[PDB]
Amino acid sequence: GVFRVAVSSMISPLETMKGYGPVLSYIEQQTGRKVELVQRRTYREVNELIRENKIDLAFICTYSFVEAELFGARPVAVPQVEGNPYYQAVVITRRDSGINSLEELRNKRFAFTDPMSFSGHIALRGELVKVDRTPETFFASTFYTYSHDNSLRAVYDGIVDGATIDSLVFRSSNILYPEIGAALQVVHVSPLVGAPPVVVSPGLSEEDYQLIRRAFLNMHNEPLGKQALDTLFIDRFVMVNSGHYDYIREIAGKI
Numbered sequence: 001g002v003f004r005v006a007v008s009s010m011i012s013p014l015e016t017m018k019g020y021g022p023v024l025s026y027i028e029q030q031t032g033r034k035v036e037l038v039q040r041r042t043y044r045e046v047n048e049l050i051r052e053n054k055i056d057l058a059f060i061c062t063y064s065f066v067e068a069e070l071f072g073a074r075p076v077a078v079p080q081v082e083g084n085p086y087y088q089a090v091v092i093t094r095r096d097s098g099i100n101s102l103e104e105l106r107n108k109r110f111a112f113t114d115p116m117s118f119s120g121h122i123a124l125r126g127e128l129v130k131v132d133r134t135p136e137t138f139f140a141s142t143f144y145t146y147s148h149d150n151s152l153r154a155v156y157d158g159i160v161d162g163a164t165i166d167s168l169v170f171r172s173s174n175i176l177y178p179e180i181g182a183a184l185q186v187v188h189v190s191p192l193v194g195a196p197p198v199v200v201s202p203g204l205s206e207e208d209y210q211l212i213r214r215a216f217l218n219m220h221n222e223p224l225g226k227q228a229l230d231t232l233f234i235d236r237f238v239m240v241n242s243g244h245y246d247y248i249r250e251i252a253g254k255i
Helices: 016-031 043-051 062-070 118-131 148-156 167-176 178-183 206-217 223-232 242-254
Strands: 003-008 035-040 074-080 089-094 109-112 141-144 162-166 184-189 198-200 236-238
Touching: 003 016, 003 043, 016 035, 016 206, 016 223, 035 043, 043 062, 062 118, 062 242, 074 206, 089 118, 089 148, 089 167, 109 118, 109 148, 118 148, 118 162, 118 242, 148 162, 148 167, 148 178, 148 184, 162 167, 167 178, 167 184, 178 184, 198 206, 206 236
Parallel strands: 003 035, 109 141, 109 162
Antiparallel strands: 074 198, 074 236, 089 162, 089 184
16 A cells, blocks of 8 residues: 655645655655655644554654654664764753843743654753753743744744754754844753654554665665755664663653
8 A cells, every 4th residue: 555654744844745755755666655745733643643553654753752662653763963863952042131041041931842842842841850840830931833943933033031942953043044043042952862763653564664674774875865865964864772762761751
């Protein structure tokens, strides 16, 4: 049958099929199966498609992966970006705010991305356990933007006092958008975590799992695979190291 690949529609609005097109063509080449792109606004909805075996493969966030593993989602491979199969969250404020630390955001307005994002939510919910607080009992108000880009924009425009976003989104935005760049500062960085594993649904056969894993790990050695990687701003796919996610697994237990 069709091979269904699920992604969030909010990471790159209007540019999702443009971004994923080449890698879907690569999956078609390596599997011989017609590929359908399945989009949802929320990572909660993407995880429910995986749980119910309504899709074969998904590009999900790192906290989504820690939840999806409990219902038998299997990691395929991990993207290596800027030479690292790992990353962190950054907390950003305006240089002119007088808010120069995570601590000084107490009783301030804060933006998260998707509730199931590590770099956009769970990193900060986890760290606040240190002082027996939650976002709701630490910040004056919280808002879920479902977008690293839109959280960065809300800090820039002064709508919120702070946000947590992916480090590469921030550093790339600083280059692309020079004025937003000069207005913003990183005041806090999270611990390191593994890059989000590409996953398959629990229903997939062991032969299909091995075929897909080998295709992802070999993608950088195939001409179409190289085009797919360049388009996604990924160096290559490397083998999953389960230990890379243990900080997130521990946070999940502490809520």
